[PDB]
Symmetry: D3
Subunit: 149 residues, 6 copies
């Protein structure tokens, strides 16, 4: 069906002027932008985001890091956006990702691997609920009949 | 200096998959993205945003059109952003636009000229106050010393 | 040797403004363009082409779809054009296509997977005779001694 | 209204690998393709096309040049295609063309200025019926209401 | 004719990842690359490069700057390289350069306008003798007959 | 850590105008340019670079080749630059090359596979020593904290 995924451009990806590039890959892919906002993640909120790892050792670092620079919060839609978004993004380790993927092309180190994507439809539904409580933008592309069906 | 300009991708700009292409253009330039959000414009809001034309005949169409689809409302900061911002977008009429400018390269008609840019710093602040009453994200690019001074 | 493959940009490819992107992919690879035409396919022809499976169920669909809009018929020459072209196009299912392939980067569904490419040297030769019974355009790229040997 | 213009990628444009670049420029602008074909030109035809200059010293030169290699004949349609097609192509002399224009960024001499478009609507119609006596392929872009009205 | 012009990507040009971008502009143009090196400028040399201004108040700043980071020194050949280089590059002040030029799309301030280009055939000759005393690379482009004659 | 790799644009890469495109990839990836020089190779020199293949029958054609056109020799730095360098370049035989790799995208035959890159780090050192005996350019990107750590 029309599932959605949460895609986030991290601090490093912003400092290195990669926003347009990332958004262009998803645009030409046929997926639909449903939500986008550029903003400074706050501590409390960041802990909320990395809550499923509050137990873990690297949690504090995660929180601290994402607070260091504004990020771009997105939500895209279409057949297999969660899984394809992951595929498009590439391996966690840049030197492991496949050429053609975002991380294989723009990243060098795991800790600065430019982007983030929901690893599942449910985690996506949860992430979307946390970042876009206000809801998303409604619209339908006039090219829909040529992308689907 | 720290001059800011309100740049917005009109609805037709979003339908034709030009979001990332436009954003890359202001990034590669060296301007800083200070605010961004993907939304659906409300009729009362559109009216205000076009207040300085309420008197003109084409007002209705202008508002009905601004609401026909979601847009990308942004704020870019940088030395002369308003002026060059307007220079980059190109003349109102596409066919009169200088080759190399956005409108000349991606548009055909005036009522569908992909994007809008503040035309004075005063109107800039007037628009920023309207679209971003909540304020702008703050950050400091590491390329700043190589872009300024 | 100098095989030729029949590459056709499907109706959706034309609507999604991907004609240039696609052709720039084959030109840059070093392949030679031998034939190219923008045309509206007629049913009898649509049927001959897909006749390889006029028996099957979905046959009707394929015929009706390739006539719903204009296409871009092309012929490309070079070493391993047939095989490499399919490699460049990517697997039938976009969601299975590898990053870097056309389908992986521009498509979402199989019904709208943007492009067709000969699947074997024989089929390639037969399609070239079907779509270009008038012959190809003979020319000698000055870049030959630099892409061959 | 939606006039049309004859756009041709000269022999040099084909050799240099610019068929893709050029097409994409026009697709991106928002013009619609109505007819395109890769082909060799016979002397007879080349003479009809430049008949208007038969009484000029440089006439032989022109005829002898369009026959040296295949070209790419195209008919593009859009508001003001002819005049903006001219502005897009750039001045006759590459060194006098405006940046952004096709000749300013891709050519060096007048004899090898890569592309050529109709200079007037009357001259366009004429070149269109001469190169495409067999007619043009009709189709309506689903993106029409976002490019016009 | 076989004119040459010294083209330099200044320190800020390297720090901003523009090397490939700039080069592609001269490559796609049809111009021939005759020399290129990535180097750190030693003070004594900078003083020699800026000698003709050795009596101006901003001389020390001009020297200090060019020493603060590596640069890419190049030599390009082609009809009207000097002046056309000046055109491609753009007006001294980025905010005054024509859209389509390097400074118009990549720079914000004059003191960091990303690149330098000889201003006259005689100056280019000096500049070349100063940075490339060791001579230039020799080659003939196969596409020569398609960009010249 | 901060390993280096010798990356060379072969003679056919220059003739084909891929210098800018290729360099832009490494810059966009986040690797650091440490050395670069457009140059003509001397026979006795080529013989030593291909020393490890002097026993083989194709050594002669191997040397006569890089000696027939100027090349661009470079040293790049970054974590895993050798491994990623090879991955980005792609299998030595273009038709086995993974989509998204420089060779899978720009090459056709082995003898004209566009680019060369260290296959191990100790060979990188062999090459850096041979081609860059005078040393490399030193500098520190301002985006360092956003690429590593």
């Amino acid at each position: 069906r029309m599932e959605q995924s949460f895609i986030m451009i991290k601090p490093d990806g912003v400092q290195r002027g990669l926003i347009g590039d990332i958004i262009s890959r998803f645009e030409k892919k046929g997926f639909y932008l449903r939500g986008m906002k550029f903003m400074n993640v706050e501590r409390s909120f960041a802990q909320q985001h990395y809550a499923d790892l509050s137990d873990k050792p690297f949690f504090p670092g995660l929180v601290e890091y994402i607070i260091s620079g504004p990020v771009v919060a997105m939500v895209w839609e279409g057949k297999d956006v969660v899984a394809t978004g992951r595929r498009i993004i590439g391996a966690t380790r840049p030197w492991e990702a496949a050429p053609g993927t975002i991380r294989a092309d723009y990243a060098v180190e795991v800790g600065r691997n430019v982007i983030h994507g929901s690893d599942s439809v449910d985690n996506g539904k949860k992430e979307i609920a946390l970042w876009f409580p206000e809801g998303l933008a409604e619209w339908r592309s006039n090219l829909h009949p040529w992308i689907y069906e």
